[PDB]
Amino acid sequence: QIRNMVEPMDPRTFVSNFNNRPILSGLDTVWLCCEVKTKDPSGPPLDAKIFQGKVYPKAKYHPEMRFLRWFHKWRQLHHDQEYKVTWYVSWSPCTRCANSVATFLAKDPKVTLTIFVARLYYFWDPDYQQALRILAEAGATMKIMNYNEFQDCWNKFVDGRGKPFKPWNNLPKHYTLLQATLGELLRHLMDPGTFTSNFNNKPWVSGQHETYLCYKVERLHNDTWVPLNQHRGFLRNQLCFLDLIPFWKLDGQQYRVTCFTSWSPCFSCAQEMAKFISNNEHVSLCIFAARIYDDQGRYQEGLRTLHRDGAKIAMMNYSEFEYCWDTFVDRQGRPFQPWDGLDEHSQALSGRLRAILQNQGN
Amino acid sequence: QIRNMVEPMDPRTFVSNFNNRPILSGLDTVWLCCEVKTKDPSGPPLDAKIFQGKVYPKAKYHPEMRFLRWFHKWRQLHHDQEYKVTWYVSWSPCTRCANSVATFLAKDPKVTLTIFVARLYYFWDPDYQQALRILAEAGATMKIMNYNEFQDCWNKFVDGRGKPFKPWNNLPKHYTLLQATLGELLRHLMDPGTFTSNFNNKPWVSGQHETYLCYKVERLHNDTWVPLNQHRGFLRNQLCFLDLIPFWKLDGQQYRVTCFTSWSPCFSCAQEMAKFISNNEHVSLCIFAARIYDDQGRYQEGLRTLHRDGAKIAMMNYSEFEYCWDTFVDRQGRPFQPWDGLDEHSQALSGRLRAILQNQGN
Ligand SMILES: [Zn+2]
Ligand SMILES: [Zn+2]
C-alpha cells in the first residue's frame, strides 16, 4: 500500500540521487524515503513519506529533521505503541542530524530506526565517522543500500510504471567499498598516539586543545554493577554525551556511567551533566579526569555543582589509564606503558581537585 | 638514491597508472616499482627496478612473475643474506600471482615482502579477496598506497625532474575506501550459511560442488603442541594449501597442521599432500573430513597413500564442527547449533573411512 500512501518521485530523480558511486561532488540534494511499521514484521506499513533537502548549512531543513518533526506530529494522532521506522536516504546524515536522531532514539524506548544509506557523506572526515558511531550507539541500525534495497525503494517510492528496477553498472562494487568503509569506521578505536598525547597528565606545553572522552555503562542487578560491553564508546570535542546513551535498552532499573575525560569538564559541560543527573534519578555518574581544565572562569563552581548533584569526581591514575588503553585504544596487542612520574603527577592533581571540591574547612 | 639504479618512468605514465580511483576500467597495464634492501632501514638500497605488464591472461608475463624471475637470478649474484623487498604496484596481484608469490614467500626464510598497492584488482570478487588473504598469511605485508607512498615513488621511480609530487583530487578519500576494503577482506571469516551448508555431513542431494578447508597450525615445545593463533586460515576450491604456510616464521623445530575439509581429498590432492608430508619430515598432518568424496576413480588409494605417508585421517564429529564454527565462522556470538543426527552420520562415515584405510584383514 506504500504506493497509495506516498506521492512517488520521478525515475530520473531516483537514478540521479541514489546512484552509489561513492564520491559524487555535484549532488547538493538529499532524498529520504521513510516507512513506518508496527512491532511485528508481517504487518503492513501504517504510513510512508518522501522527504527532500539540501546538504549545505541550516540543518533544520534537512530531511532528517523534517522527518523528526513530521513523526512527532504523527505519533500524536495514533495510539501509543512501538514503531519500526526504515529509511532509504541518499546521503548519510551530517554531524548535527546524527546528534539529533541519536538524542531522539536514546530518549525514546518505543522507536526502532534502521537507516539504509546509498552513499556515505564525508566518510573521510573524522567528525562524520564519529557521527555514524554516535548514531549506531544510540541504537540506530546503519547499513549500506544493496541491490535488494534499491529494488525495494524503486518498487515502493518511485513511479516505476510497472517497470522493474534496472541497476547501473558497478552497483555491487560501490556497495563493497561503502560497506567496508562503514564497517571499519563503526568498529574504530582510538589511535595509540592520540591516546598517549591527549591523556598524558603532565603540565600542558603542547597540543591537547581538544577533549577526549571514553565511557562505559554498568547496570545494577543484585547490588553488584554488572558491565554492559555493548554500550562503551569514545568521543572527541572541540550537547552532553549522556544524551546519546539509550538508558532504556540496557536491561532496566538503574545504571552507573563511568567517564574518563582527558580534560576535566569546563563550566557548561559540568552544568549539563548536573542537569542530566538531576533529571534522571536512575543514573549515577563517575568522572575520571586526566587533567584539570582551568577555563579562567567558573570551572571550580561547575565541578562543585556537579559534585553536589551526586557525581563522583576523581583524577585518573595508573589503573584508569591502563583500562582505557586496553578498552578504547587500537593497542594492537601491545601493552600499556606508563609515562615517567604518572603516579606522582596524578596524586598532585588529585590534591588540587580535592582542594577544589572541599566544602567544609578543617 | 634509487634514481641511480632505475630508468625512471614518464610523469604522464605515473599519474595515469597510479591514480587510485578505486574503479578504473580502461587501465589494463600493471606497473611494479621494486626496491631491495638488507634487513635494517638505515641501509641504502642494493638495487631497484620497474616492471610492466598487462592485467589480462598469460600471467607468466605479469610483473610479479617477472620480478620473481629477476630476483631469482639476482640473489645468485650476491652473497646470501636476508632481504627486505618493497613493492609499489598499481594493481593488486591476480589470483595466480598471489599464489606464486605466496609459495615463494612460504618456502623462503630470507625474504621479507611489503606490497603497497594503489588500487585493488577485483576487490568485489571472492577469489581475489581470498588471493589477498593467501598473500597475507604467507607473510607478505599488504598495504594501500597513501600520500606518503605516492610521494616516495614519485621521488624514487619517476622522472620528476626536480618537480615535487602534486596529488590529484580525492587521493585521501580513495585511500580511505581502499584500505577499509583491504582491512575487511583481510579480516574476513566464513559466512554462517555457507559453513553449515558445506560442512553438513548428511548424504549429498544439493550443491556442495566446491571444497571448503579450514586449517590451524601448532608447533612443538616441551612435548606439548602449542597453538599459533596467527597462522590459521580457510580456503575455497573448485597447488596444495600446505605450500602457502610459512613453516619457518615462528619458533622452529617441528609442526602439526590440523585440517578440516568439507570433502575428503580427491586423488590428486591426496598425492600432493603426500608429496609435501614426505618432503617435509618436520611437519605432521591431521585431516578431518566432513564427508567422503567418491570421485568415481582412485580416491581410495589416494587416502591410503596419504595414510601410509604419516597423515592421520578422520571424520569430523561434534567437536570439530563446533571448533570451526567458533574459530573460522562469522558466528556473531551465536553458538554452534548441530543438525539432527550429526553424530550418527559421523559414526557411519568414520566406519566407511576405516574400511577404506584398513590394510590388514581381521
Ligand atoms: Zn543533516
Ligand atoms: Zn598477475
Author numbering:
A (entry chain B), B (entry chain A): 4 to 142, 147 to 245, 260 to 383
Task: Provide text from the study.
APOBEC3s (A3s) are an APOBEC subfamily in mammals that restrict viruses, including retroviruses, endogenous retroelements, Hepatitis B virus, and Epstein-Barr virus. The double-domain A3G, A3F, A3D, and single-domain A3H (haplotypes II, V, and VII) are active in restricting HIV-1 through deaminase-dependent and independent modes, with A3G being most potent among them. For the double-domain A3s, the deaminase activity resides only on CD2, but the catalytically inactive CD1 is important for regulating nucleic acid binding, processivity, oligomerization, packaging into HIV virion, and effective anti-HIV activity. In order to understand the structural basis of domain organization and molecular regulation of the complex biological functions of A3G, we determined the double-domain structure of rA3G.
While the FKL structure shows a canonical fold of its CD2 domain, the E/Q structure shows significant alteration in CD2 conformation, with major changes on helix 2 (h2), loop 3, loop 4, and the Zn-active center. The long h2 of the CD2 in the FKL structure has become a short 310 helix (h2′) in the E/Q structure, resulting in a disordered 14-residue stretch spanning parts of loop 3 and h2 (residues A246 to E259). The shift to a short 310 h2 and extended random coil structure is necessary to avoid clashing in this tight packing conformation. However, this also disrupts the conformation of the CD2 Zn-active center within the regions of h2 and loop 3 that become disordered, resulting in no Zn-coordination. When aligning the FKL and E/Q structures via their CD1 domain, the CD2 domain of the E/Q structure shows a rotation of ~29° compared with the CD2 of FKL structure, causing the E/Q CD2 domain to shift ~15 Å downward and ~8 Å toward CD1, and resulting in a much closer packing interaction with CD1. In the E/Q structure, the two domains interact mainly through h3, h4, and h6 of CD1 with h2′, β2, loop 4 and loop 10 of CD2. Additionally, E/Q* carrying individual mutations F126Y, K180S/L184S, or CD2Δloop3 (as in FKL structure) are all active, even though the activity of the FKL* construct (with E259A reverted back to E259) with the combined mutations is less than E/Q* and WT. These results suggest that even though the crystallized E/Q structure, lacking Zn in the CD2 domain, represents a catalytically inactive A3G structural state, reverting the catalytic residue back to E259 can fully restore its deaminase activity comparable to WT. Full-length rA3G dimerizes through a hydrophobic CD1-CD1 protein interface and dimerization generates an area with intensified positive electrostatic potentials (PEP).
